[PDB]
Design a protein around this ligand. Structure first.
Ligand SMILES: NC(=O)c1ccc[n+]([C@@H]2O[C@H](COP(=O)([O-])OP(=O)(O)OC[C@H]3O[C@@H](n4cnc5c(N)ncnc54)[C@H](O)[C@@H]3O)[C@@H](O)[C@H]2O)c1
Ligand SMILES: NC(=O)c1ccc[n+]([C@@H]2O[C@H](COP(=O)([O-])OP(=O)(O)OC[C@H]3O[C@@H](n4cnc5c(N)ncnc54)[C@H](O)[C@@H]3O)[C@@H](O)[C@H]2O)c1
Ligand SMILES: NC(=O)c1ccc[n+]([C@@H]2O[C@H](COP(=O)([O-])OP(=O)(O)OC[C@H]3O[C@@H](n4cnc5c(N)ncnc54)[C@H](O)[C@@H]3O)[C@@H](O)[C@H]2O)c1
Ligand SMILES: NC(=O)c1ccc[n+]([C@@H]2O[C@H](COP(=O)([O-])OP(=O)(O)OC[C@H]3O[C@@H](n4cnc5c(N)ncnc54)[C@H](O)[C@@H]3O)[C@@H](O)[C@H]2O)c1
Ligand code: NA
Ligand code: NA
Ligand code: NA
Ligand code: NA
Lengths: 333, 333, 343, 343
């Protein structure tokens, strides 16, 4: 059974998820088994395929996107995720207007429209995909979803699954709250840290390290160990669009203080790094709501920077246990 | 108590170990604690410091090195490990002549001289540091060491700790046999494999990868997953000397088949990559002979490519247990 | 007015040229002006556009290519230039059998058949695009072309335009002979050389440099160099070229170059350069072939036989040698060739 | 015959120049001929060697540098050019106080003291090596130098040699004025520009390029660019320069450059270039200062006041502008300067 998905923010991430889902649908037609799908960690989570996605509802504020049909809105400037060259289906609907800051309060009429629209579209999951920095919106879309009984997924660093009192409510309603903050499918950081891990595991000394990142999309434009230096915003480069380039240097010291030098360059489709992980959180969301597991799922920990309860309080057994019980409860029901 | 060390082959590795040991001795004088030593995994193994090294005996065949005083022999052309700029001590002795292929047999007089020289120098460890490819020599130096009751350490890919019947003998005499084949302190391979590990751990698809290596020393000159390609001998480059340069490419595929590109360059002092690991094997050797633990030590597994018993049959608990019992038996005695 | 173009060897280079020409034809329709064509230094040469190409004749020895229709032969194994995603047209002919070493001699039945095919197909230019190392074939296809009055283009390091008596005969017969040896559109060695140029021009001292190349096509597999190390002469006592570091199957027709330069500046402090170059190796051919084949055809139309100086900048080994030619020699030949075609 | 050299600003550049000069002095002893000196384009300029330097005078405002003996001041925080491991000599003087913005005016007690110090120290050249952005100081130290008849060298982008009336006065007084703005021995922008040059010279199309720089010294911290993007003009609608990507403390006086060039060749196939440049940023200064200060001194000894054309290749903003000078203009000035010194 397909996930009925609502979207708060129709950016590069949603362009990647929407086009992505129909590329995998096309590969199924062509004759590719999901075992062989590129970029897919779990091809099934509670029986949900990577392609078992229906968009039912969408909220933006941007004039190119509000009261545009969804199909057209996702591809609309200033979105610069590439055309993946797949005839995308028209899912029948038009992007509703989002909450402005003044409509934060659950008693606003805007608020009332969103709650009514989630109820009427029979959404299961609301995907929060806004610009980073809007704490009022993350809270607001989450109470909207909460009141509507719809699972909430926070892609952003805003406190939602991390505000202890809002988690309690979600726990109490049998509603899943997945957050906070996407860990990129394969990001600068996880590569940088693996290499520094290698140096100290084998007993090399770190003299210094730097990592710097370049991007050309709205996300990047918005955001813009003694001798480790991290520059998460080295420069906006318009021609890079939704690509992100990272360059890192490690200077280690080996036997006798001889230098170990590492020079590394990473290029990725930045919003594929989002999609690669949203498609897991989306499915942990839906499968949990269907089986009534409200609050935070430990299945979501490995693909989140700031999960409810914090990384320190979780082993990868906790994670694998949660996938096993979520999948085994669904098989059962 | 200092390790009395014999050396079969006075190459770049021994230049690195000999100079290295006196650089750490100098840092102790200057006022550096061994906690803060660059490139040192275990600063103590059975009470042995990285600087608790006495060369007592040496075998080569090269005219620059045979019947030269050791101090001068290690630095002698065609050795191109750098002068680390430390006044090295003169350990009093001269490099004896090695075994030629015809003197393989334990009944040769050459053989008799080596066995007598290990006995007279009261060596504890014989370090086998010859060119790769000389199976007759690895066997011969090992029987020489065996008869002499002296621990044997194989840096090379030749079968020694891996020939089942020769291990049995070493087991039976209470003599340690550490082998086979050094894993570089931080080599091309361990970096390449960690990065490929990252791609499949997170569920990225590998499209291709290549790794190529460049060197300019005698070792390199001697040696000279469907779409992974490893070129361990991309080219001899004389000006690189004992430096080794590695370049690797990984092309992954992410969500929706978007490319993940990685480009990496590693430069190291290749024979510091040997020294960084010999200094551990050397000490597992000595400490085991002092405490009468003959045969293979599991402590040696993490720093060997082809350990006796094979990597598959060892967990890092086996390794850490063996360090704990070796150190705890020495404290005890 | 389209070049009737004959091909000795249906390799990566002709996959690139044929598909390339139909990609530019497509861009013409979909709207793009030829001044905006990517990778074209000169969009017309004696009024011949980058797309004004009719393949009339093709010669190979590989069983996947012989008696296969051209359209299919160019894409056929082990050719691994990419599919460019253009409706490649069917020119309506098939790859005939080439000369094997024993058919070298002009009175062989092969030789007579080829001189037949060049005359019958009304070819204007024969493009010699065989593997490097086949001196008998370069000579043979060249005398084949001469006999039938068809212009000859040598992609390879083989001696053809450089043998003064064969040049003389071509010169006197009113037939163009263009060679020898393609200088790649953008080659490893011009990049390495330019950077070394910079260091010594501003007086930085060279400690050391290396260049290594990686490839995965039949050309690279065949080559498997002195020209490269001359290029860089600059103290070269510590400059190493590895022109074949290794064959990487999944690169196909891609070529990768990696270079290191270690300078010393004031007080012997290091100036370090690390560079990676990636290119479509056979685009580096076709980007220069399209120049030479048009230099060829327009010259035969205007009866300028022998070597054209317009060919010099895109050749390693032009007839008469680089030292006997300036930029103006090359320009004078382009301007004269274009302007005579005019009248 | 040694240059008596005065310094306005004891930064990384003078750490590099002072230690550099004593490293070459050491190499002379330990045996090395000056033609084998690393990083020296011209080992003599009017018979002045790379080591023929007497520091006589020094002016700063930083408390670690003022009233400290020169020897100690050059190495003093926050100067982070390396120690080169040479016995640096003690020239026997101490860093005097510089001009603060209020002491600009020539009748201030500071100004009078400095004109005192230049006359008393018998300085021949005043090297202006302050931070970029201080137009009042460049003018002030320049009139200070003029009044005392001492040659002036402008390292900075400030208008000095380029203000035509100050030039006129220097010209007429028989005093050399050399400026403005050092072109680094080997700079990011000449590498980027050379590579972009290659692509368009051979007719490859630019899709896109970026250049970013990293540093860790006071110069880089101060700068924290238009000149850079002009250099590269070549379709630059997709060429981005970030001249200050970020300040990395553990780089100190090192500077790192990273560049990307994305060309299109035949049939729009990509030509990709990735480059890393590492240099000792203040060696890139001293490698050119040693040229300018000798151009300065030899010209004052021979009474060639005003701007010398020999200075052109090592300056961004020479008096009269690059467009009014050829390579021969520069050569003619070097050859004349050396040869007059002779007689
Ligand atoms: N791989 C990654 O992209 C990565 C990594 C970690 C976290 N994230 C985070 O994911 C988020 C989404 O990034 P993206 O590339 O999709 O961003 P984007 O900037 O392209 O999309 C944001 C969308 O939200 C819309 N919007 C703004 N205010 C709104 C409102 N009040 N209501 C509804 N819509 C509103 C914008 O108009 C736009 O359509 C960002 O916060 C980013 O930092 C992404
Ligand atoms: N990091 C590394 O260097 C690394 C990695 C893994 C394994 N290894 C292996 O370590 C070994 C030693 O490398 P190296 O750099 O010291 O080598 P090297 O080639 O510099 O030294 C070899 C020495 O052995 C001497 N020799 C040759 N035949 C001899 C004989 N019969 N008896 C005695 N001496 C003899 C040679 O003259 C020379 O002095 C090589 O087999 C290498 O492959 C090294
Ligand atoms: N960047 C470049 O690609 C570049 C640069 C300069 C020069 N060149 C040279 O151009 C030549 C062609 O390059 P390519 O990649 O197209 O090579 P290729 O290997 O792809 O093409 C060679 C073709 O010749 C055919 N052939 C072999 N023997 C023949 C014979 N006797 N008669 C007729 N056909 C025969 C082969 O089957 C194959 O079809 C090579 O010599 C290469 O070095 C290429
Ligand atoms: N590669 C290069 O280093 C390079 C290239 C071209 C131009 N330049 C320019 O040369 C100049 C010097 O470079 P640097 O790295 O030596 O700089 P620095 O910051 O190391 O030196 C500046 C010095 O000026 C001193 N000072 C400040 N105000 C003063 C005043 N009013 N009077 C006297 N002294 C004063 C500062 O304390 C410091 O000692 C900078 O403008 C730089 O841009 C450098
Ligand atoms: Na994004
Ligand atoms: Na070695
Ligand atoms: Na080719
Ligand atoms: Na500087």
């Amino acid at each position: 059974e397909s996930i009925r998905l609502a979207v708060a923010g129709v950016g590069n991430n949603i362009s990647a998820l929407f086009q992505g889902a129909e590329l995998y649908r096309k590969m199924s037609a062509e004759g590719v088994a999901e075992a062989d799908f590129p970029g897919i960690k779990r091809p099934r989570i509670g029986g949900i395929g990577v392609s078992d996605l229906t968009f039912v509802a969408a909220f933006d504020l941007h004039p190119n996107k509000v009261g545009v049909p969804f199909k057209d809105a996702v591809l609309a400037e200033p979105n610069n995720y590439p055309l993946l060259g797949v005839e995308l289906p028209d899912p029948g609907f038009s992007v509703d207007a989002g909450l402005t800051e003044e409509d934060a309060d659950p008693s606003s009429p805007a608020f009332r429209r969103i709650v009514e629209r989630l109820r009427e579209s029979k959404a299961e999951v609301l995907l929060y995909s806004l610009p980073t920095g809007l704490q009022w919106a993350a809270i607001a879309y989450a109470r909207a979803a909460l009141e509507a009984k719809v699972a909430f997924v926070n892609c952003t660093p805003e406190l939602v699954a991390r505000t202890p009192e809002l988690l309690e409510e979600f726990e109490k309603a049998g509603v899943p709250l997945i957050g906070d903050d996407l860990a990129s499918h394969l990001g600068t950081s996880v590569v940088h840290r693996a290499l520094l891990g290698l140096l100290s595991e084998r007993g090399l000394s770190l003299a210094s390290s730097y990592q710097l990142n370049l991007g050309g999309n709205e996300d990047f434009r918005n955001l813009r160990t003694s001798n480790v230096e991290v520059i998460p915003s080295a420069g906006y480069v318009a021609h890079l669009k939704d690509h992100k380039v990272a360059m890192l240097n490690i200077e280690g010291l080996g036997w006798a203080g001889t230098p170990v030098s590492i020079d590394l360059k990473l290029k990725v489709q930045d919003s594929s790094n989002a999609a690669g992980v949203i498609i897991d959180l989306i499915r942990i969301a839906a499968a949990a709501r269907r089986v009534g597991f409200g609050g935070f799922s430990a299945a979501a920990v490995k693909v989140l920077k700031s999960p409810a309860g914090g990384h320190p309080s979780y082993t990868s057994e906790d994670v694998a246990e949660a996938y096993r019980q979520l999948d085994a409860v669904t098989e059962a029901m």
